[PDB]
Design an enzyme around this catalytic site. Structure first.
Site, mmCIF file in Angstrom:
data_model
loop_
_atom_site.group_PDB
_atom_site.id
_atom_site.type_symbol
_atom_site.label_atom_id
_atom_site.label_comp_id
_atom_site.label_asym_id
_atom_site.label_seq_id
_atom_site.Cartn_x
_atom_site.Cartn_y
_atom_site.Cartn_z
ATOM 1 N N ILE B 84 0.849 -1.184 0.000
ATOM 2 C CA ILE B 84 0.000 0.000 0.000
ATOM 3 C C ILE B 84 0.887 1.236 0.000
ATOM 4 O O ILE B 84 1.904 1.283 0.702
ATOM 5 C CB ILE B 84 -0.944 0.014 1.221
ATOM 6 C CG1 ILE B 84 -1.802 -1.248 1.253
ATOM 7 C CG2 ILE B 84 -1.827 1.247 1.214
ATOM 8 C CD1 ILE B 84 -1.530 -2.118 2.458
ATOM 9 N N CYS B 85 0.501 2.239 -0.785
ATOM 10 C CA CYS B 85 1.208 3.516 -0.805
ATOM 11 C C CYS B 85 0.791 4.329 0.414
ATOM 12 O O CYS B 85 -0.330 4.845 0.474
ATOM 13 C CB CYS B 85 0.914 4.272 -2.098
ATOM 14 S SG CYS B 85 2.130 5.553 -2.511
ATOM 15 N N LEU B 86 1.689 4.442 1.394
ATOM 16 C CA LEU B 86 1.450 5.280 2.569
ATOM 17 C C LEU B 86 1.667 6.750 2.205
ATOM 18 O O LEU B 86 2.570 7.430 2.694
ATOM 19 C CB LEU B 86 2.343 4.849 3.724
ATOM 20 C CG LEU B 86 2.036 3.501 4.386
ATOM 21 C CD1 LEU B 86 2.382 3.557 5.864
ATOM 22 C CD2 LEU B 86 0.578 3.093 4.188
ATOM 23 N N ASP B 87 0.793 7.231 1.321
ATOM 24 C CA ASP B 87 0.972 8.534 0.696
ATOM 25 C C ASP B 87 0.878 9.658 1.719
ATOM 26 O O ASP B 87 -0.052 9.705 2.529
ATOM 27 C CB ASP B 87 -0.077 8.728 -0.402
ATOM 28 C CG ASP B 87 -0.268 10.188 -0.776
ATOM 29 O OD1 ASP B 87 -1.255 10.796 -0.307
ATOM 30 O OD2 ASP B 87 0.559 10.726 -1.545
ATOM 31 N N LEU B 119 -1.596 1.521 -8.380
ATOM 32 C CA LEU B 119 -0.527 0.591 -8.049
ATOM 33 C C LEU B 119 -0.671 -0.743 -8.762
ATOM 34 O O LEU B 119 0.330 -1.437 -8.958
ATOM 35 C CB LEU B 119 -0.466 0.346 -6.533
ATOM 36 C CG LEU B 119 0.458 1.271 -5.737
ATOM 37 C CD1 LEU B 119 -0.247 2.574 -5.376
ATOM 38 C CD2 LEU B 119 0.966 0.567 -4.489
#
Lengths: 74, 150, 377
Positions: B84-87, B119
């Site tokens: 997961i992109c921990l944006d 993603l």
């Protein structure tokens, strides 16, 4: 020391750097020339994405090396 | 031999759980967490249970907790490894964020897929051109992989 | 040739032509894109199809979303390159607590405001260390270092900054921090309790020292950029401002206009918009700072989710502004030349067809160059 920062439109700028300047500082130096806040920048060198916290000597950026300024992300 | 912030953060997650989210530490490693997030209703993941793993690096306090989906999920913001992109946009990870902030983020992400920020490009390709069939696929994966998995 | 006609021309042109506003020919977009994308092409099999796969996946023709770039070309259209170059030399004014200097900087002229907002990038980590083992030219920067006889800040440029603490104060703090995982840790920890022990009483006291010392230390990083256009109105209450922006990995200025956020925020009123711009810098609650941040700069529609969760705004913000004059006959001239460039080089019956031809031409240039780099192996 001198590095070049090229963009997708061809606009090339010269920055006066030191081999120990971090990527955050070279971003700030682009902010000096262009008025682009470093939070609005991504720098690429030889395909690899330059990360904040590391130095020019890490990615091995020599004199007359050209960096790519990306101005569009996801 | 472990900081106090991690202990009270742990305890406040067992004592005051987040609805739809279960997080308890690993038996051998107080920095490893086994997470179960329920599929939010009014989402293609409703009725599903999703296993995740949350790891606190040794620099977790100043660093960003690494999270990964274990359950297979059809979501444009989860790659085939479960990442997961921990944006954090126009800012970096600060110690003002917690484990619970991350857990709420994944839960919110399951309810708001962002195909323009992909993603899984083939999945996000379907989420844009044929959203009604991407959602149809996500519901199918929920039954296959995210039911009776816990 | 009105100032409001200038706003209506640039908004209509950015809305329809996207990146073509910048006047770059598509051949150079394809050539530069091919240069930076050559390594992405598969090396084996049908090279014609391998190149095609990469050209399809390119977004070179999509408009910029760096805010500084958007501000730059907004300035470069309303003022010209020479006028914007002259605009760059002027200095930014920090917005006062209630936005007084900004309201007092907008006389009834055709005015363009440029804003550079900064976030406070003060250090969050500390480290106990001995003078023998402390090299400023190697250790982590933007960090606090507690030595036995000195408390010190290592800023973002590698400069060593003394924090005005006696050697006795540092000796007591140095020896109180004994636990190994508290040697290199964070400063402001909500969970440490001074009544707990002497270590956390010292860690907390050090945090209060560092916090007090850095409200006079300049640790700002530029985070956001945008421009505001204020045309001349025939009366004092018909005056309205139009903010122009793009946001990093979020939206372009073309999307800003399509969703009509420029005119949505204009209906806030001049005094109302500046008031929210002022409360953004003076508030100390993250929920109010994030709420205003989301209202002002979030894409159209995402005002209530843009700064929540991970994107909560925990850092103090500072808005800076600079104002100059706009000559509508200059700006409209600069825009009609772009329309001229677009029409003669990329003609079509509508903007949709003109953009398709622009994207097509950029792809054929990118294709033709890529074929030349990969034929040689």
């Amino acid at each position: 020391m001198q590095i070049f920062v090229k963009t997708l439109t061809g606009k090339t700028i010269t920055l006066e750097v030191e081999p120990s300047d971090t990527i955050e500082n070279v971003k700030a130096k682009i902010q000096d020339k262009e008025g682009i806040p470093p939070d609005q920048q991504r720098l690429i060198f030889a395909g690899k994405q330059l990360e904040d916290g590391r130095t020019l000597s890490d990615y091995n950026i020599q004199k007359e090396s050209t960096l790519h300024l990306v101005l569009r992300l996801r | 031999g472990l900081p106090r912030r991690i202990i009270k953060e742990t305890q406040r997650l067992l004592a005051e759980p987040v609805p739809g989210i279960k997080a308890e530490p690993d038996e051998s490693n107080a920095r490893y967490f086994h997470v179960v997030i329920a599929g939010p209703q009014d989402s293609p993941f409703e009725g599903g249970t999703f296993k995740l793993e949350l790891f606190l690096p040794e620099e977790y306090p100043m660093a960003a907790p690494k999270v990964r989906f274990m359950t297979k999920i059809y979501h444009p913001n989860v790659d085939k490894l479960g990442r997961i992109c921990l944006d954090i946009l126009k800012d970096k990870w600060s110690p003002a964020l917690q484990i619970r902030t991350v857990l709420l983020s994944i839960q919110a992400l399951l309810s708001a897929p962002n195909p323009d920020d992909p993603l899984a490009n083939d999945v996000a390709e379907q989420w844009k051109t044929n959203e009604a069939q991407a959602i149809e696929t996500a519901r199918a994966w929920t039954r296959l992989y995210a039911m009776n998995n816990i | 040739k009105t100032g409001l006609h200038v706003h209506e021309k640039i908004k209509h042109m950015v809305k329809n032509y996207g990146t073509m506003i910048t006047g770059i020919p598509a051949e150079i977009l394809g050539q530069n894109e091919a240069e930076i994308s050559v390594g992405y092409v598969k090396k084996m099999g049908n090279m014609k199809e391998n190149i095609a796969e990469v050209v399809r996946k390119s977004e070179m023709t999509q408009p910029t979303n760096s805010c500084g770039k958007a501000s730059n070309e907004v300035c470069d259209l309303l003022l010209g390159t020479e006028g914007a170059s002259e605009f760059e030399k002027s200095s930014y004014q920090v917005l006062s607590g209630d936005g007084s200097n900004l309201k007092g900087s907008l006389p009834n002229k055709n005015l363009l405001v440029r804003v550079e907002m900064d976030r406070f990038n003060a250090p969050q980590k500390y480290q106990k260390i001995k003078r023998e083992e402390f090299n400023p030219e190697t250790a982590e920067k933007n960090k606090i270092y507690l030595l036995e006889d000195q408390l010190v800040y290592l800023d973002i440029f590698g400069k060593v900054i003394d924090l005005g603490q006696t050697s006795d104060t540092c000796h007591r703090l140095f020896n109180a921090i004994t636990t190994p995982f508290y040697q290199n840790y964070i400063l402001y920890d909500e969970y440490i309790d001074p009544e707990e022990s002497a270590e956390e009483a010292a860690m907390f006291e050090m945090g209060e020292i560092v916090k007090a010392k850095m409200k006079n230390i300049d640790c700002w990083t530029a985070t956001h950029s945008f421009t505001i256009f204020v045309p001349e109105s025939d009366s004092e209450d018909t005056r309205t401002l139009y903010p122009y922006q793009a946001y990093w990995t979020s939206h372009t200025l073309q999307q800003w206009f399509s969703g009509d956020k420029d005119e949505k925020l204009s209906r806030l009123g001049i005094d109302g918009y500046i008031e929210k711009l002022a409360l953004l810098g003076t508030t100390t609650d993250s929920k109010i700072r994030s709420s205003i941040y989301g209202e002002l700069f979030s894409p159209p529609g995402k005002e209530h989710v843009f700064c929540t969760g991970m994107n909560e705004k925990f850092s103090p913000l500072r808005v800076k502004f600079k104002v100059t004059e706009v000559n509508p006959e200059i700006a409209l001239q600069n825009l009609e030349e772009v329309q001229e460039f677009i029409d003669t080089n990329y003609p079509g019956e509508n903007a949709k067809d003109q953009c398709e031809l622009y994207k097509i031409k950029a792809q054929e240039a990118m294709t033709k160059q890529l074929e030349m780099r990969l034929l040689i192996e």
